[PDB]
């Protein structure tokens, strides 16, 4: 039983693509073809924030009783310049609710452009390390780091990865998930 609830935003919800082209579904295809027992449940919603997810999580945990929760949230809070202290409170509560439901929890590190200056971007990214220290959630590398500088992998809007990016993200997530579940 390695059932992983993916609590993400547009970076995991196949924004601008068909759901079947998105990395979560491509990653399940890979698992299915390699005799894995991992099952991904995608609960990602485009535009989701840390506080919006917090309002949904109790119901998702009751619904699926996942053994693992992988959080990929906060980019929308940071793009909007929301206070990092409040995002940190919200993400910590997400982790603690997941752990209280017996789910092993991972948190993806997120990076944002300096739309509110470099110091806010550092405050924002460092908060994920602080939540991991506070909760013991497993920190995951941001899969966009090696994608966002490649224009052939990004949609016209320069924000969302395109269809070509999805197999690449699938392979980074295969590796990050494998390291977590051996970790």
Q: Quick check: is 175 catalytic?
A: no
Q: Which of 110, 28, 176, 129 is nearest to 19 (CA)?
A: 28
Q: Cα angle at 53 between 48 and 128, to 5 degrees?
A: 85
- The alpha helices in 65-117, defined as continuous H runs, are 75-79, 84-100
**If 0-12 CB within 10 Å is exposed, 13-18 middle and 19+ buried, where does residue 152 land?**
exposed
CB-based contacts of 142: which residues, under 8 Å, 6+ apart? 108, 109, 110, 111
Residue 92 · residue 134 · CB < 8 Å = yes
| SS3 at position 22 | coil
- The alpha helices in 34-164, defined as continuous H runs, are 50-64, 75-79, 84-100, 118-135
Angle, helices 165-182/23-33, rounded to nearest 10 degrees:
60
CATH number, domain containing residue 7: 3.40.50.1110
Q: Quick check: is 171 catalytic?
A: no
- Technique used by the depositors: X-ray
Residue 44 · residue 12 · CB < 8 Å = yes
CB-based contacts of 77: which residues, under 8 Å, 6+ apart? 49, 50, 51, 84, 86, 87, 90, 124
Q: Which of 1, 37, 152, 157 is catalytic?
A: 157
- Specify the DSSP element, H or E, that contains 23: helix 23-33
Q: Which of 129, 139, 133, 55 is nearest to 97 (CA)?
A: 55
Residue ranges making up the domain that contains 67: 1-183
In 3-state terms, the chain is what percent helix, strand and coil (to 5)?
50, 15, 35
Sign of CA dihedral 15, 139, 152, 34: negative
State the resolution, in angstroms.
1.4
Q: Which of 9, 10, 44, 68 is catalytic?
A: 10
CB-based contacts of 179: which residues, under 8 Å, 6+ apart? none
Number of domains in the chain: 1
Q: Cα angle at 132 between 182 and 165, to 5 degrees?
A: 65
Task: Output the six-digit token pair for 139.
Answer: 């920190």
Distance CA 171, CA 58 (A): 30
Residue 106 · residue 137 · CB < 8 Å = yes
Q: Quick check: is 160 catalytic?
A: yes
């Amino acid at each position: 039983d390695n059932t992983i609830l993916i609590l993400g935003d547009s970076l995991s919800a196949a924004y601008g693509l068909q759901q079947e082209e998105g990395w979560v579904k491509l990653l399940q295809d890979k698992y299915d073809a390699e005799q894995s027992d991992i099952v991904l449940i995608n609960a990602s919603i485009s535009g989701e924030t840390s506080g919006g997810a917090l309002r949904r999580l109790d119901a998702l945990l009751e619904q699926y009783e996942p053994t693992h929760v992988l959080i990929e949230l906060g980019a929308n809070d940071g793009l909007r310049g929301f206070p990092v202290k409040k995002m940190q409170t919200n993400l910590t509560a997400l982790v603690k609710k997941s752990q209280a439901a017996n789910a092993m929890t991972a948190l993806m590190e997120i990076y944002i452009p300096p739309n509110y200056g470099p110091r806010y971007s550092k405050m924002f990214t460092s908060s994920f390390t602080q939540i991991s220290e506070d909760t013991n959630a497993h920190l995951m590398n941001f899969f966009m780091l090696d994608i966002a500088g490649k224009s052939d992998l990004m949609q016209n809007d320069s924000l969302h990865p395109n269809k070509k990016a999805q197999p690449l993200i699938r392979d980074e997530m295969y590796d990050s998930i494998k390291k977590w579940l051996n970790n």
